[PDB]
From Swiss-Prot, chain A:
HAMAP family: Ribosomal_bL35. The keyword Metal-binding does not apply. One of its GO terms (biological process) is translation. GO terms for molecular function: structural constituent of ribosome. The keyword Ribonucleoprotein applies. It holds the Pfam family Ribosomal_L35p. GO terms for cellular component: cytosolic large ribosomal subunit. SUPFAM superfamilies: L35p-like (SSF143034). This is Large ribosomal subunit protein bL35. Part of the 50S ribosomal subunit. Residues 1-47 are annotated as: Disordered.
Swiss-Prot record, chain B:
It holds the Pfam family Ribosomal_L20. This is Large ribosomal subunit protein bL20. GO terms for biological process: ribosomal large subunit assembly; translation. GO terms for cellular component: cytosolic large ribosomal subunit. Belongs to the bacterial ribosomal protein bL20 family.
UniProtKB/Swiss-Prot annotation, chain C:
This is Large ribosomal subunit protein uL15. Keywords: Ribonucleoprotein, Ribosomal protein, RNA-binding, rRNA-binding. It comes from Bacillus subtilis (strain 168). One of its GO terms (biological process) is translation. Residues 1-13 have a biased composition (Basic and acidic residues). Binds to the 23S rRNA. GO terms for cellular component: cytosolic large ribosomal subunit. Part of the 50S ribosomal subunit. The keyword Disulfide bond does not apply.
Swiss-Prot record, chain D:
InterPro entries: Ribosomal_uL4, Ribosomal_uL4-like, Ribosomal_uL4_dom_sf. Part of the 50S ribosomal subunit. It holds the Pfam family Ribosomal_L4. HAMAP family: Ribosomal_uL4_B. Residues 59-70 have a biased composition (Basic residues). Belongs to the universal ribosomal protein uL4 family. Keywords: Ribonucleoprotein, Ribosomal protein, RNA-binding, rRNA-binding. This is Large ribosomal subunit protein uL4. One of the primary rRNA binding proteins, this protein initially binds near the 5'-end of the 23S rRNA. It is important during the early stages of 50S assembly. It makes multiple contacts with different domains of the 23S rRNA in the assembled 50S subunit and ribosome. Forms part of the polypeptide exit tunnel. Residues 47-84 are annotated as: Disordered. It comes from the Bacteria.
RNA sequence: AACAGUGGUAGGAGAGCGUUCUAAGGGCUGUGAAGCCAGACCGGAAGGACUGGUGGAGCGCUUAGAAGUGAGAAUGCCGGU
RNA sequence: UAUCCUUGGGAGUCAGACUGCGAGUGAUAAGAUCCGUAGUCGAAAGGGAAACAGCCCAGACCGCCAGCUAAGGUCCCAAAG
RNA sequence: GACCGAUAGUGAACCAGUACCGUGAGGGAAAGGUGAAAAGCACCCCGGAAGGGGAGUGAAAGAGAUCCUGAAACCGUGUGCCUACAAGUAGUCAGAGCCCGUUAACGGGUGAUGGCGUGCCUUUUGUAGAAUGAACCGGCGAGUUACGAUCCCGUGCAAGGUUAAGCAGAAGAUGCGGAGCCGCAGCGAAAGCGAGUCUGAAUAGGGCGCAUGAGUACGUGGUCGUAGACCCGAAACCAGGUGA
RNA sequence: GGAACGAGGUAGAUGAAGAGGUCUGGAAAGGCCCGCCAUAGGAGGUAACAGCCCUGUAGUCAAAACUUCGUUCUCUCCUGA
């Protein structure tokens, strides 16, 4: 059978041009009183998946273009 | 296609049993204990090929010492004497002289003795 | 070539590794799986992306965005591709699809402005970039939207 | 390349130019090897099976209680370590066929034909027409052409008279221009193609 | 050729031996095949020959291909003792 | 002197042990326990410590009935005062 | 038929769902081969017979009914060397004596005596281990296959690469089949814009991209996913039946 | 519901070519030297491995009776802009 995409991951990551994965930051849901504006500005931006994690989960997104 | 066990297993085990000829009881008859003993014999044969070179040197030194003390020298001083005289005859050949041509050995011993008394 | 003198190209084929066929192979006994624990068991190992109970990466991160049903994708053609044609030709999506310049039409053809175009063409496409429209007109051509 | 154009008798009627795009290319040995393996694999029937421990008759109940008896623990008399038991893995029905890219297919057949020309094993006939199906007639024709080992005869269209005359001779195969293939050409030492058949083969490949 | 190096568990990498089957070439065999039994032969190893005895009809070799392809251990299964 | 870095393929490992040195816990006990640091073992055969994974000396590709040394020794066992 | 060849292949090559086991449902074996032809050993001898020894048949009886071949364990007979003062993981290295004569080799067999030396495996920091496994011999017995993903290697073509089902055809090769799939363009949640794009008030900065380019089809190999998924092993759970 | 016809199924028929010579051998189908048939060089058997020894095979034929399908005819039924 075809390998099945991990649907939870498909909702969280996006492939970049060179095949990196784009992600959102954690700690961006609530409790913003407890975070400085500097943190909030930075957590608002996207990030890339780390090398360590990328190899663990690369196969979960194989079907995604 | 199915691969039957065939004749390969028996051939391999027979070779080991042939190497175990002359072993005691089951050790020349039963593959497992024969196989163990042949393997063990391998380690022993390696070890002893290196031990052989020590046993014969040990034997030569013992013989030279006996012959040396017939000329009033210990082995220690005889060998020192030969080194000072530049004699490169080794202990295998010195022992051979001591046993087969004692007069020749005494000549070398006298050479050593000259150097020691110098 | 002879059926009795066949040779594969060098390095085109390799022999498979057969584990658990004796010490000397180097994959004897444990067959490459080390000693004990979950990873050495038959059908062992944890599911992809499992982290031993630490919250998986994907679950730590928030979902983003939505999918637009009415999303249009255009078969893009840069100006360098149009340069392959001959002068005076009216480059339509039908011409592009037949000659294999584009593989699939999707929602239409969009001309983009990467590269140079040194030919007068009558480019008929669904969409043009500002750069592409300028460049097609600059070389004496016509950039008609259809 | 030029080759002698014969007639059934065996006399040379001058020469003929084969199209260099088909019979003149440098044989690509690597693709020929792949073509040969692919074709032989496609011939495999692959009807072979064994019974695993689920398929072997019986074996439901536990042979004896897990503890106390002093025997090794067992779950079924059809476990693969039991005599009579299931096989672990082993043959299962499958197909061996796979497909090379079209261009590799064409390159393979062109390589093999051009190799025939390099070895002077390509015999071109003005035509090959037998009056009646008669193996004696065909055997005489082959001897006339000095055909000793195997030979592949390639006619333009279905030639019933030739097919029947050559059917029974060992190592002599008859084929239509459509039916020519890498394994057949490589297998048979000589290639007897008719002039009409050469153009049909060229038409497709060229 | 010179120089240097060459202990090894888990494990990674490379090069090989051997078994069954297929294809293609080339052979062996009732003047004795395979198997079996000896031997003091050969190769760096897996292994391969040669000779003789038994056996009484099948079997190697070269290149390539495909695997039910290699056992000393599982209180393994079965048989024999 | 000949490593080092980047990328990618495949791993195994998460029970460690002792010895010396610097500390904690303990009683300035433990072949105890927990760290730092170096070594050996693990995964290291050979020589010495009678025997003796972890101590001393020293790293086994293979042959030699050759030589020089290390720790440790040289009256006999047992080579050498 | 690059399926098995009598522990294999159906449980069952054979009077097998039989024998046997169970109250019953049910479970469930072992066991093939004389010879080309019975020409299946007339007759004689020992014996109650069995079983032998001759003689005949036959190419062969060392093919005589569990009758092709006949391995190992195991059990014996004969004897070339050794053995009754010796402490043995049974060998190995040294070594007389005695006895042989080979694939002719700085040969073979035996071994008074000397030196060294606590099996194999598994599991362990560490096992000769008084930790585990194996009475012995033989056979059988464990990373495989399908479909996907990814990387390396090989080949074809290359800004392109490739067909799937299906139709013709030897259950084939091949021809046709361009639907579809991947790549050449990315950025953004998206509208959308596009070698840029998103964020932002911003020709600012920054992110991801481009300039700094190679993909694709197929094959081999490594690994991974889904399948029993390297093999063996629970106590249990559930469903339908069989038993007072 | 019924006919006529065609092609099949359920038994079969016919069917080419060497005891060729010679060599071992218990026995040739094997070896050697020669032929011949082939729309037949599928296969099994026959005293060792047979296209030409047997049953067969290719090819061409064959059905009293039963049965399957097909095509015509009979038969049946029928207004739509
Ligand atoms: K462990
Ligand atoms: K013989
Ligand atoms: K360990
Ligand atoms: K048998
Ligand atoms: K066993
Ligand atoms: K009842
Ligand atoms: Mg076996
Ligand atoms: Mg290893
Ligand atoms: Mg284990
Ligand atoms: Mg938790
Ligand atoms: Mg079951
Ligand atoms: Mg196996
Ligand atoms: Mg401790
Ligand atoms: Mg140890
Ligand atoms: Mg070393
Ligand atoms: Mg010295
Ligand atoms: Mg002394
Ligand atoms: Mg059976
Ligand atoms: Mg026979
Ligand atoms: Mg312990
Ligand atoms: Mg245990
Ligand atoms: Mg036990
Ligand atoms: Mg007849
Ligand atoms: Mg006949
Ligand atoms: Mg015979």
């Amino acid at each position: 059978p075809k390998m099945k995409t991990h649907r939870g991951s498909a909702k969280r990551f996006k492939k970049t041009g060179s095949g990196k994965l784009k992600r959102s930051h954690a700690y961006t849901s609530h409790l913003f009183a407890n975070k400085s504006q500097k943190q909030k500005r930075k957590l608002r931006k996207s990030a890339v998946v780390s090398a360590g994690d990328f190899k663990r989960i690369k196969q979960m997104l194989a079907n995604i273009k | 296609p199915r691969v039957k066990g065939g004749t390969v297993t028996r051939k391999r085990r027979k070779k080991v049993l042939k190497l175990a000829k002359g072993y005691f009881g089951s050790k020349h008859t039963l593959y497992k204990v024969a196989n163990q003993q042949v393997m063990k014999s391998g380690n022993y044969a390696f070890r002893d090929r290196r031990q052989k070179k020590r046993d014969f040197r040990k034997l030569w030194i013992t013989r030279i010492n006996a012959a040396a003390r017939m000329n009033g020298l210990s082995y220690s001083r005889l060998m020192h004497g030969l080194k000072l005289s530049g004699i490169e005859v080794n202990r295998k050949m010195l022992a051979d002289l001591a046993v087969n041509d004692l007069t020749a050995f005494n000549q070398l011993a006298d050479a050593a003795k000259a150097q020691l008394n110098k | 070539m002879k059926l009795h003198e066949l040779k594969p190209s060098e390095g085109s084929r390799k022999t498979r590794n057969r584990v658990g066929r004796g010490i000397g192979s180097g994959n004897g006994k444990t067959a490459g799986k080390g000693h004990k624990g979950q990873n050495a068991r038959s059908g062992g190992g944890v599911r992809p992306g499992f982290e031993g109970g630490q919250m998986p990466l994907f679950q730590r991160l928030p979902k983003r965005g939505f999918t637009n049903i009415n999303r249009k994708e255009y078969a893009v053609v840069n100006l360098d591709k149009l340069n392959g044609f001959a002068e005076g030709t009216e480059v339509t999506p039908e011409l592009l699809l037949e000659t294999g310049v584009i593989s699939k039409l999707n929602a239409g053809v969009k001309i983009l402005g990467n590269g140079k175009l040194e030919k007068k063409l009558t480019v008929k496409a669904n969409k043009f970039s500002a750069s592409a429209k300028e460049a097609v007109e600059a070389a004496g051509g016509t950039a008609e939207v259809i | 390349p030029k080759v002698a154009l014969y007639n059934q008798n065996g006399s040379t009627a001058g020469d003929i130019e084969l199209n260099a795009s088909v019979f003149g290319i440098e044989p690509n040995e690597s693709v020929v090897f792949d073509a040969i393996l692919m074709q032989r694999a496609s011939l495999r029937q692959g009807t072979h099976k064994v019974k695993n421990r689920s398929e072997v008759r019986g074996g439901g109940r536990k042979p004896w209680r897990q503890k106390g008896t002093g025997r090794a623990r067992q779950g079924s008399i059809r476990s693969p370590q039991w005599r009579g038991g299931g096989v672990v893995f082993g043959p299962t029905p499958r197909s061996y066929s796979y497909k090379l890219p079209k261009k590799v297919r064409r390159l393979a057949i062109k390589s093999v034909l051009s190799s025939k020309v390099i070895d002077n094993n390509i015999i071109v006939l003005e035509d090959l027409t037998l009056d009646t199906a008669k193996t004696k007639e065909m055997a005489a024709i082959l001897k006339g052409l000095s055909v000793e080992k195997k030979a592949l005869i390639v006619t333009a269209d279905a030639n019933e008279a030739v097919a029947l005359s050559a059917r029974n001779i060992p190592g002599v195969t008859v084929v239509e221009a459509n039916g020519i293939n890498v394994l057949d050409v490589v297998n048979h030492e000589k290639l007897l193609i008719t002039k009409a058949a050469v153009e049909k083969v060229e038409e497709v490949l060229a």
